[PDB]
Design a protein around this ligand. Sequence first.
Ligand SMILES: *CC(=O)CCNC(=O)[C@H](O)C(C)(C)CO
Ligand SMILES: *CC(=O)CCNC(=O)[C@H](O)C(C)(C)CO
Lengths: 367, 367
Amino acid sequence: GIGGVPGPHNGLTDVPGVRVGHAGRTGDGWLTGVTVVLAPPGGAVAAVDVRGGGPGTRETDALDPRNLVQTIDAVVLTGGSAFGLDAAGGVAAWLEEQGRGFPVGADPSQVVPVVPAAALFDLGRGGTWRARPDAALGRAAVEAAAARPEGDPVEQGGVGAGTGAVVGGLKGGIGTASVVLDSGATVAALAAVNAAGSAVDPATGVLYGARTGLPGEFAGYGVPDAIGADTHARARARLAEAAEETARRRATTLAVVATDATLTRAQAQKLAGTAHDGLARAVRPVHLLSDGDTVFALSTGRRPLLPDRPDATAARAFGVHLEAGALNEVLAAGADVLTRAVVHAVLAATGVDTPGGVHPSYRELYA
Amino acid sequence: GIGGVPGPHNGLTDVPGVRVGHAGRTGDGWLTGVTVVLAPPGGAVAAVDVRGGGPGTRETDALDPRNLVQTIDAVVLTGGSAFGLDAAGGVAAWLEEQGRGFPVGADPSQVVPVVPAAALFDLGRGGTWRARPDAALGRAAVEAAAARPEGDPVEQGGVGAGTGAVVGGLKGGIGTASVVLDSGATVAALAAVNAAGSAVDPATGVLYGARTGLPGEFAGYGVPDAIGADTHARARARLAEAAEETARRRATTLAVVATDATLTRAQAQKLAGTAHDGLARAVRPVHLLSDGDTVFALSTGRRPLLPDRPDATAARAFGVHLEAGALNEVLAAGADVLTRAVVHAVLAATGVDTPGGVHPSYRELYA
Ligand SMILES: *CC(=O)CCNC(=O)[C@H](O)C(C)(C)CO
Ligand SMILES: *CC(=O)CCNC(=O)[C@H](O)C(C)(C)CO
């Protein structure tokens, strides 16, 4: 009864201790930003799965299950394509100042922060080609995460890494969702949706990810349950026109999935992997050479995976395995929270019109 | 142009020179079998992506892009869980008899066949726990493949590896689909569907994969595309009946994706990866610890990726890259054909009732 519903704010921060910060620059040629997910003091077990064919990434080898540093404090998601990876340097600097990183000496101030990053391509979308996130903007983002209270609703839409995100020609952005499992563990996702493929079924106008939604969760946005053939046809025409104008004017989904269920790094790497199936149910096509799709998975380690006295109803792989049963539930939830966070990204967005592109939002076309 | 429609029979053998063979055993305790995809003489460039958390496989390392043997002749999909991998030895023996394999000597008869295989769990579904595919059954499957003409319609349903296959409690089976690209290249999938998760949305009775179907392709199966609340209620209860009876009596999707577009092994390996997204769109949940989901990708290397009129209509990644654009189309097609093949598997199945299980088909419940 207590599972199958969202956590308190239906977002990443429903995983207690997890913090989210956005920093962006809009106007005067700029339409880009950075989003930082910051783990609670002491770090979180982290893993990654880079599945798109055209990634821009940093520090992903350090996250291999074989390797030395198992827990990290921060994950960076950034615009500005590979240049935007510069933002991570500013987050490492802040963490160092905070004394947070892997200890490399006797002096507890001697730490080396392991800061993975992934980037999305938004170059020129504000008008100025070289307007990209830098160290200072990465630092701003992590400082804003540190400044938030625990369990603060995550801000969605055209903010942080989603500031210049575009999804199938429509304005994309930041989206987030959570679910509580029957065990009391929370699983949640945050996504910066910048897909080259479409979040929208081109035959009907329906959001691919919608049917994975929990009851009523999208209502606060106000979108018809039937989409008329005419509404959809006008929408397609508008989008084709914004796309043609965008093109004349011009002369990847990044995600973090988190849970408070205690996962080893290998299990978190499997979670990052199953989250990609949630992405596939929300966007089509995905993971192509032109997509940089990357999922980071975090576990705060606060709840055991399996409760202390299992029922006949506890999930069991092959009828017998309780740990694998409990892990399957987390993995399937990882997919579902990412599908749902994609839909929220698409519904939370508002359109833009700059010298670097015209991108109407889903609601502007269908609401 | 000519793309976005099926090839002549809407199946793997639309990829010219590709052959499919099934051998199975039904009755007297048995409900299992083997399916072999047999490439044309000279072999096919092959790769693999094992994404399920509970695989049973053979000879997957030999298909790494870095390694020695880049082309192979046969891929084996088998029932019988890990025991059923024995079937591949019979296929290797037959290929050696044919002089087909990696040359290991000046003598042309001296070959070592690289025969990758994957297995699906169907133990005891015929009534007898130890009735599993063996080498003779694998040999029968590849002999059956070799005797087929080119372009032969693929047999679907409870045949071959699909003989004992079950998908979310419903009878699973073999399914297949193809699509032609604008280039004239064909991309196709064959799937043996045995998922622990569901091919059906539990709120509507709708097949997850259907909205990826090509218009009209499923019409022959005589299944409504809008399901009444009364039908759905009856179907749920019937399945739950079968499932309880199955449990009393007793008390993974494997796929080959092929194309004639010339691909490098690394390109085919990416294709085996994107195909898994198409599996995600047909089955939920998937890729879990209890799923042994495996995709093998084959290229017959008969048509260049690029034809020769690079119209402002030939796809281009980032507006400029012709080769990456053409590959993107194959990668996206690889996902879609596997989604559609899964639906065909579900629709082609007919139900079973044996001492080891009761598994009604989707059509028996919904049509
Ligand atoms: C999906 C997307 O926005 C592409 C993200 N990747 C990049 O921007 C890379 O740095 C590219 C593909 C431009 C260069 O390797
Ligand atoms: C998806 C499925 O049918 C299971 C395929 N894998 C197996 O049968 C393995 O051999 C198991 C998981 C039983 C043991 O490693």
